[PDB]
Amino acid sequence: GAYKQVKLGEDAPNSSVVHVSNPETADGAECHLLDFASAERPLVVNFGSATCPPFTRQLPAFRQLVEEFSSVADFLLVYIDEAHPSDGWAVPGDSSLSFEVAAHRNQEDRCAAAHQLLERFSLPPQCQVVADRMDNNANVAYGVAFERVCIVQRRKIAYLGGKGPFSYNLQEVRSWLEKNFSK
């Protein structure tokens, strides 16, 4: 109504997004989040942007999850609005892991930033990538505060990272996957 609040167990919002080609569908094609979900296979959805350090710091660990589990689970990176958009002048005095991105003007800018991200962090095609639409519908529906992971299973939210200081933890996602595939 006036605000959204998603929780564990609820139906996963079928947000509108745009494909970002990640070759080994047409680049920029419109699609929906649940287009990437299949049978009882978990879909691990990782929301963030290049200027969000908690997100980029764990992108290598995300890549490893994709490598270890893509035969049994699907992976989707949803590129949202920049956490810390650049103004182009100030020089990060520390060498930083990720790269600067200015505030997106349009969908093309957001898709371009996702293309930059995929190259910088060596994400493989099995890590499917989309960009949120410019109305930020996926960001708002999934309650993302700069970065979040949601695992969708059987059309419902099976895992939803919390709001604590260290709630964004891809090794907790690893644990979920280990449990799901264990006897």
Numbering used by the authors: 70 to 93, 103 to 261
Tell me, in the authors' exact words, what the paper reports.
Iodothyronine deiodinases (Dio) are selenocysteine-containing membrane enzymes that activate and inactivate the thyroid hormones (TH) through reductive iodide eliminations. The three deiodinase isoforms are homodimers sharing highly conserved amino acid sequences, but they differ in their regioselectivities for the deiodination reaction and regulatory features. Dios feature homologous transmembrane regions and catalytic domains with a catalytic selenocysteine (Sec) residue essential for their unique reductive deiodination mechanism. The Dio isoforms differ, however, in their regioselectivities: Dio1 can catalyze deiodination of both the inner (tyrosyl) and the outer (phenolic) ring, while Dio2 targets only the outer ring and Dio3 only the inner ring.
To explore the molecular basis of deiodinase isoform differences, we solved a crystal structure of the catalytic domain of Mus musculus Dio2 (mDio2cat; residues 71–262). The catalytic Sec130 was replaced with cysteine to simplify bacterial overexpression. Two lysine residues, Lys180-Lys181, were predicted as the best SER candidates based on sequence analyses with the SERp server and consistent with the structure of the homolog mDio3cat (likely surface position) and were thus mutated to Ala. The protein mDio2cat-(Lys180Ala-Lys181Ala; mDio2cat-AlaAla) indeed formed well-diffracting crystals and the structure of mDio2cat-AlaAla (from now on referred to as mDio2cat) could be solved and refined at a resolution of 1.1 Å to R/Rfree values of 14.5% and 16.9%, respectively. The mDio2cat structure comprises 183 residues, covering an N-terminal Gly as a cloning artifact, a small part of the linker to the transmembrane region (71–76), and the complete catalytic core (77–261), except for the C-terminal Arg262 and residues 94–102, which are not defined by electron density. All residues of the structure are within favored (96.5%) or allowed regions (2.9%) of the Ramachandran plot, except for Phe224, which is well defined by electron density. mDio2cat features a Trx/Prx fold with deiodinase-specific modifications and insertions and high similarity in the overall structure to mDio3cat, confirming the proposed conservation of a Trx/Prx-related fold among the Dio isoforms. The basic Trx fold provides β-strands β1–4, and the sheet they form is extended by a single strand, βD, from the deiodinase-specific insertion that further comprises an α-helix αD and the extended loop-D (residues 161–188), which protrudes out of the globular structure. A major difference between Dio2 and other isoforms, however, is a 15-residue (91–105) “Dio2-insertion” in the N-terminal region of the catalytic core. Interestingly, there is no electron density for nine central residues of the Dio2-insertion (94–102), indicating conformational heterogeneity or high flexibility.
